[PDB]
């Protein structure tokens, strides 16, 4: 009742406000970081959530950072082709002993905010960059 209404107020205000504030600032920081590496292949992204759905930006970012060419993307504009390209990128990430969890192809394709942010965070933190 009223106590439940107060609990709903507390959670909806504080938890959601703090989570969204931190997530917005980290999204801006991650976008600014990834654009610098993506500029060398003359590719630029505007929104981090939507432009990683297709999967070509992710495979080109891994192309920049690794220095080794990846298998070519599948020629398609469907859902299953996006799943193929994201699976290729995640297989390459598994190949370099980087540990990822709760991260399937459909999570990146459907555009989950937390999992995309976690993938970018793991790329920033654990991955080895050579020049």
């Amino acid at each position: 009742d009223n106590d439940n209404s107060s609990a709903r107020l507390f959670e909806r205000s504080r938890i959601k406000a703090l989570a969204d504030e931190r997530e917005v600032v980290q999204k801006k920081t991650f976008t600014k970081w990834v654009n610098s590496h993506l500029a060398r292949v003359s590719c630029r992204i505007t929104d981090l959530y939507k432009d990683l759905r297709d999967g070509r930006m992710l495979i080109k970012l891994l192309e920049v950072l690794s220095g080794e060419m990846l298998p070519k993307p599948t020629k398609g504009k469907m859902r299953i082709h996006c799943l193929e390209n994201v699976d290729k990128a995640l297989q390459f990430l598994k190949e370099q002993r980087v540990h990822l969890e709760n991260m399937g192809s459909h999570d990146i394709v459907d555009g989950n905010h937390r999992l995309v942010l976690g993938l970018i965070w793991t790329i920033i933190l654990r991955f080895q960059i050579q020049d």
Binding site: S6, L9, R12, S13
Partner: protein
């Protein structure tokens, strides 16, 4: 005929998306105001019970 109809339907898609975004902004502002008002109510409740 089909090439004529394409631009027409795209125009209402454009307008609908625009005021959908406007309505979303208005709704989230109203939600924030309502939460702030309700915690303002709890404060005076604590006044009276103490």
């Amino acid at each position: 005929s089909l090439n004529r109809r394409i631009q027409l339907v795209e125009e209402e898609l454009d307008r609908a998306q625009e005021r959908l975004a406007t309505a979303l902004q208005k709704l989230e502002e109203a939600e924030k105001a309502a939460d702030e008002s309700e915690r303002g109510m709890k404060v005076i409740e604590s006044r009276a019970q103490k």
